[PDB]
């Protein structure tokens, strides 16, 4: 059991790993253990067609689009230290971008 765990969750790639995620918080091969259910699961993406895939591929787009955002309200949310924190890691991070005017 749980209850929560972070603001963005780790959203797929191209969209294999969403079909599973599903397969993973469905609980249709909680039957057997993880290593089965993987490879159970592989093998019902491998079962449907197309059209899913590309479902699933195109949602992964918008989850990684979303969780980008979400990123940012999670840190909207991080308090005046943590925060604090956080921008620590950013700045030195990337290379914020200048302007003209």
């Known amino acids: 059991?749980?209850?929560?765990s972070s603001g963005p969750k780790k959203p797929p790639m191209n969209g294999?790993?969403?079909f599973s995620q599903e397969l993973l918080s469905n609980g249709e091969l909680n039957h057997l253990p993880?290593?089965?259910?993987?490879?159970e699961i592989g093998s019902r993406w491998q079962r449907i067609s197309q059209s899913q895939k590309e479902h699933y591929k195109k949602l992964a787009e918008e989850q990684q689009r979303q969780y980008k955002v979400?990123?940012?309200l999670w840190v909207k949310s991080?308090?005046?230290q943590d925060r604090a924190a956080y921008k620590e890691y950013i700045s030195n991070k990337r290379k914020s971008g200048p302007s003209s005017g």
């Open 16 to 18: 294999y790993q969403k």
């Open 78 to 80: 991080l308090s005046p």
């Open 70 to 72: 979400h990123l940012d």
């Open 1 to 4: 059991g749980s209850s929560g």
């Open 34 to 39: 993880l290593k089965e259910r993987m490879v």
